[PDB]
């Protein structure tokens, strides 16, 4: 079975605050604020259908890790994942 890369931290936001966090993301107010802003913009973004958030996942890919962000609907779920 396929090898899934390690998680490096989680963050759950429930506007505006940190509801839960662990690992690299634990009590990191700056990251939580910056994610919250990115997510609000991404959520407000429309391609060609007003009644459609044009993503099911937002991923921010860095050299060694990626932040995987899902929204529903006033909460934000973040996993920091090692790259494959």
């Amino acid at each position: 079975l396929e090898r899934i890369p390690d998680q490096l931290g989680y963050l759950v936001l429930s506007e505006g605050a940190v509801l839960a966090s662990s690992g690299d993301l634990e009590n990191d107010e700056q990251a939580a604020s910056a994610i919250s802003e990115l997510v609000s913009t991404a959520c407000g973004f429309r391609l060609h259908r007003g009644m459609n958030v044009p993503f099911k996942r937002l991923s921010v890919v860095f050299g060694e890790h990626t932040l995987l962000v899902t929204v529903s609907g006033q909460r934000v779920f973040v996993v920091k994942r090692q790259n494959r």
Partner: peptide, 19 residues
């Protein structure tokens, strides 16, 4: 906004909106 998520190791991210 995504650039703020790091103090770059020269680590400029790709933002991907996945549908």
């Amino acid at each position: 906004q995504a650039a703020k998520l790091t103090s770059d190791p020269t680590d400029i991210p790709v933002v991907c909106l996945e549908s």
